[PDB]
Symmetry: C2
Subunit: 386 residues, 2 copies
């Protein structure tokens, strides 16, 4: 069924993804669109297959972190609009227009130089642009209404650029104190209305993320940007509280046992530093995953895996490519049994939220640091492919 030389892999359930998008579509207003966020290799899930599926079941645009992530999607066949969320260098203006990637921009001088570059060539490639307004994130974007007016005029004069959006970003919308989130919203609404008093007509307006759309659905306007909710995970434990939308997690991680032995002979030391010594009756099983795959070294002598429906512990330090687990005295286990690292087995579970809690971080980082050297398999309609 699954045949590998080194026996470790990931499974992505695409029937879960479709349900997560149903739930969201049926929460926000009917007049709002969905932009699916698939940067950082689909948050560790794989960007190509998730985008393809999301476009068939409710989304109409995509977002990525860089031009290079967008070009991978065009070569897979996708003709939908693609927006780049970070900052793009002027030396990629010609390539973005050629592949028809939408760029973010917020400076008067960037606009003119990008216009002159496409004018010194020709090509019916007009470059599409979204303007970023910084209302409190403090990362990228324009920050005063006088400055925004200068950028909008510099762009409306530029014959080879085309204005298709304006957005902002909320920095604390996953928290129970809503003070700063409403501040940001008032500031954005006033800037937009100042443009209206001057006779300027507005394109697509977007501002919400996963937490903003669950919590303040009346901020949806034209479009939202759905990210972490696409993959079946909640922005914060607090947003899980409200109990407004039901999501189902899409990823799990598995391996097969490589060797089993009893520690009868001496010495009975295990792994680097010899931080663990076994009984003469203890059974030790070896597994093919290590910290270079993204399984944190801080889980030395601390973590768990599921074998035959029960949790067994890591024994000794984590190494680059393998870990050892203890089956205890008596023992019971064979070369080739299936183990679950994240996910479910019978009626037991080790969830990604649990591991992130144990390591003092967030679920976002646990999934998106899973190495590309692990192969990905996709389930759709109960059957497996790649």
């Amino acid at each position: 069924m699954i045949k590998l030389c080194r026996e470790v892999w990931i499974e992505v359930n695409l029937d879960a993804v479709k349900k997560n998008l149903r739930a969201i579509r049926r929460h926000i207003p009917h007049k709002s669109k969905i932009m699916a966020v698939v940067k950082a290799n689909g948050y560790g899930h794989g960007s190509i297959e998730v985008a393809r599926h999301a476009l068939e079941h409710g989304a109409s645009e995509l977002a990525v972190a860089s031009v290079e992530e967008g070009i991978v999607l065009r070569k897979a066949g996708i003709t939908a609009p693609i927006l780049v969320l970070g900052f793009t260098s002027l030396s990629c203006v010609k390539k973005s227009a050629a592949w028809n990637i939408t760029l973010s921009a917020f400076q008067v001088d960037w606009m003119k130089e990008a216009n002159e570059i496409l004018e010194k060539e020709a090509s019916a490639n007009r470059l599409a642009i979204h303007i970023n307004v910084d209302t409190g994130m403090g990362r990228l974007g324009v920050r005063t209404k006088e400055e925004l007016l200068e950028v909008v005029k510099a762009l409306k004069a530029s014959k080879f650029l085309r204005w298709t959006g304006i957005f902002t970003h909320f920095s604390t919308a996953d928290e129970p104190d809503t003070t700063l989130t409403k501040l940001q919203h008032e500031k954005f609404i006033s800037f937009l209305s100042f443009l209206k008093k001057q006779g300027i007509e507005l394109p697509t307006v977007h501002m919400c993320n996963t937490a903003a759309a669950i919590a303040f659905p009346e901020f949806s306007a034209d479009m939202i940007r759905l990210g972490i909710g696409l993959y079946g995970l909640y922005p914060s434990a607090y947003i899980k509280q409200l109990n407004l939308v039901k999501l189902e997690p899409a990823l799990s991680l598995k391996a097969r046992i490589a060797y089993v032995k009893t520690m009868r002979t001496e010495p009975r030391t295990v792994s680097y530093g010899a931080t663990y010594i076994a009984e003469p009756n203890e059974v030790i099983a070896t597994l093919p995953i290590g910290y270079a795959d993204g399984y944190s070294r801080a889980l030395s002598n601390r973590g768990f895996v599921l074998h035959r429906g029960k949790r067994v512990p890591v024994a000794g330090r984590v190494t680059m490519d393998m870990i050892m687990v203890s089956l205890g005295e008596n023992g019971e286990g064979k070369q080739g049994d299936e183990v679950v690292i994240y996910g479910k087995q019978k009626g037991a579970e080790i969830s990604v939220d649990e591991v992130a809690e144990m390591l003092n971080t967030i679920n976002y980082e646990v999934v998106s640091t899973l190495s590309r050297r692990i192969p990905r398999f996709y389930i759709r309609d109960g059957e497996i492919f790649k």
Copy 2:
């Protein structure tokens, strides 16, 4: 010079890899060969170009973690012997014999069935095997002198296999207490003395890693396995202190500044959670690197980068694709300046070993978790390619 859409990259200095190989050659006996370890994408440095250079300057063989990692090396034109250090499933016996990859084994029944697979397909190729003996690591390998002889017996009665090595691994050779290292050596030697009193001839013998080649060159036997020393990093502070061999680090990580602004209007909050609030004359700069690249989120409000030879601090939380740093009141900087994240700039340095200490791990983990969406550039005789 370097031109990028998203402005972040790695530089790997092959002139430094060459000097590391020379220093090790002069310190060990002349009869002993060198096997270069490039598993896990060359400890994060890139496996292809580093293997090429190493075989041009002293190494005779290579080691990897899995059949798939060896296949990337053969596809780029490399014909040297390649040994898999982990466990390989019988699924890939026919494939390994076709791409001429050497595998480790230590079980009588695995030996028997591997021989059968290649028998029933005729096969002109003979699968090369190395036997792993477990003297104190507790990970994989054979444990008693009687059952090692059954395995030697079975491998010998197998016409489609070829015995080309026997080895073991030291579990504490980087520590001041040399008790256990002396004991494992003693056991390993009496096992081959046992085998030699039966008329059995021995193939290539190897036991040393980086640390045990430096502290005990009299253990070199036929061959050593040079891993972290090749990249210019010391296995421990204790081995670095003995001042026996001089290594030079190969890797640096850089980027360019995306945006600059003075926090004149309100609110002056910076990044998710609003964990840092700026001053109205403070200058804030935005860089394109994040925790999905492998820059740990635990460096939020804690780490540094180098700008114009100064250490400058991360402001607020690390995000998936970007960080923010503070230039101070009326600070000095321009959109496009060069920043150093790991490495040396003007008179300053942030070393990999410092970042590892700050996060309570070892230098192995820091380098081998740098993501593959970051491009690697190679420097040889002081100039650029790839």
